[PDB]
């Protein structure tokens, strides 16, 4: 079976900027597209299961743990729960000017441990191939690099595919993230037609992904820079403690304070 997790980056600052701009695309339509994708994923098979996470500057919250209109009861419950919870989360939110960048990585960690919990609980008879369909919507924060890299490596070890679906911006950190675990990277330039991209590129599971034509991966610039002025460097002088990429040979690296002996 397959356990899909949709990590939606519903950043109020950026989505409300879109709302003020009165652009055609809106967070409501984005949520509807994600809902349709999840419904189709479960539609694929009974054993398949899904979950949803929404990201905010403060924290990240799960959007998912009759036939009034003649509809599959389970998908109806999914629609109702996600709609109600997303509206509640968006309606209620404190204001903090100091922190405005979206905390995308923190949710990833929640997704990973949730997948681990589900893998533990599920019977050993059936093998579960989990996936994380990250949908970024705003620029990433520099300060989150370390933790995001930790979670990416944890996902690599635990065999989960991070399929990035960045839109309106190309996050180098996120493309690097999905490249490590082999997840697909699609940058949709036509936001109104986003759902067609999901039902082709992302929706097919890892089982059938190899035996299918999908957009080629984007080249990844694995840049390195010294800790002084933040710029690309091809040669780094790291020590045996900090393991920090530096500018030039120095008597002692500041982040270490070690008694380096010249030679």
Partner 1 sequence: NLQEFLGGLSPGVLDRLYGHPATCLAVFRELPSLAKNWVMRMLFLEQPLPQAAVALWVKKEFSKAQEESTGLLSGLRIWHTQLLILNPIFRQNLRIALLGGVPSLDKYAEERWEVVLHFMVGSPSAAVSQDLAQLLSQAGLMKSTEPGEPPCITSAGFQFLLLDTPAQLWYFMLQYLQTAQSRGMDLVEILSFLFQLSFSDSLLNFLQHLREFGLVFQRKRKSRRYYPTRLAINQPGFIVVETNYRLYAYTESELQIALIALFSEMLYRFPNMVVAQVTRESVQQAIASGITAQQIIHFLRTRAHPVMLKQTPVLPPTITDQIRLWELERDRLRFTEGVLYNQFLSQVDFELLLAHARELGVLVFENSAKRLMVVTPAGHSDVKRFWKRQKHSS
Residue 161: name the closest of 111, 107, 120, 219 by CA.
111
What is the smallest separation between the CB atom of 159 and partner 1, expressed in angstroms?
21
Residue 255 DSSP label: T
Give the separation between CA 195 and CA 109, rounded to whole angstroms: 26
Query: Nearest distance from residue 205's CB to partner 1, in Å?
Result: 9
Angstrom distance (rounded) from CA 54 to CA 38: 14
Q: Taking CB under 8 A as the rule, does residue 43 contact partner 1? A: yes
Biggest alpha carbon distance in the chain? 81
Residues linked to residue 54 through DSSP beta bridges, in sequence order: 8, 61
Tell me the per-residue interface mask from 202 to 221 with partner 1, x by CB under 8 A, - otherwise: -xx---x-xxxx--------
Whose Cβ is closer to partner 1: residue 24's or residue 208's? Answer: 208
Nearer to Zn ion, 149 or 226 (CB): 226
In angstroms, what is the C-alpha Rg of the chain?
21
Near partner 1 by CB under 8 A: residue from 13, 58, 72, 190: 72
Pick one of Zn ion, partner 1, none as the site partner of residue 226 (Cβ within 5 to 8 A by kind): Zn ion
For the segment 192-251, give every residue that binds Zn ion (CB under 5 A).
Answer: 226, 228, 239, 241-242, 247
Please tell me the distance from the alpha carbon of residue 69 to that of residue 48, in angstroms, as a whole number: 24
Kindly state the DSSP code that residue 234 receives in the 8-state scheme.
S
**Look-up: residue for tokens 């919507």?**
137
CB 113 to partner 1: min, Å: 28
**Contact positions with partner 1 (CB under 8 A) in 74-113:** 75-76, 78-79
Which residues contact partner 1 (rule: CB under 8 A)? 35-36, 39-40, 43-45, 67-72, 75-76, 78-79, 195-196, 199-200, 203-204, 208, 210-213
């Amino acid at each position: 079976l397959n356990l899909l997790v949709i990590v939606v980056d519903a950043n109020p600052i950026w989505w409300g900027k879109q709302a003020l701009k009165e652009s055609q695309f809106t967070l409501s339509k984005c949520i509807d597209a994600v809902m349709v994708l999840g419904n189709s994923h479960l539609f694929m098979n009974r054993s398949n299961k899904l979950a949803v996470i929404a990201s905010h500057i403060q924290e990240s919250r799960f959007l998912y743990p009759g036939s009034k209109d003649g509809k599959y009861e389970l998908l109806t419950s999914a629609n109702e729960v996600i709609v109600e919870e997303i509206k509640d989360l968006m309606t209620k939110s404190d204001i903090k000017g100091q922190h405005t960048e979206t905390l995308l990585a923190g949710s990833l960690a929640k997704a990973l441990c949730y997948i681990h919990r589900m893998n533990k609980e599920v019977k050993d008879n059936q093998e579960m191939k989990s996936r994380i369909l990250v949908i970024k919507a705003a620029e990433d924060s520099a300060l989150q690099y370390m933790n995001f890299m930790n979670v990416i490596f944890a996902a690599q070890k635990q065999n989960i595919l991070i399929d990035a679906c960045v839109l309106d911006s190309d996050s180098g950190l996120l493309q690097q993230a999905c490249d490590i675990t082999g997840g697909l990277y699609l940058k949709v330039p036509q936001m109104p037609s986003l759902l067609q991209y999901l039902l082709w590129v992302f929706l097919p599971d890892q089982d059938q992904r190899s035996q299918l034509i999908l957009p080629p991966p984007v080249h990844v610039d694995y840049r390195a820079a010294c800790f002084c002025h933040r710029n690309l460097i091809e040669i780094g002088y790291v020590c045996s403690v900090c393991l920090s990429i530096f500018c030039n040979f120095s008597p002692i690296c500041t982040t270490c304070e070690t008694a380096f002996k010249i030679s």
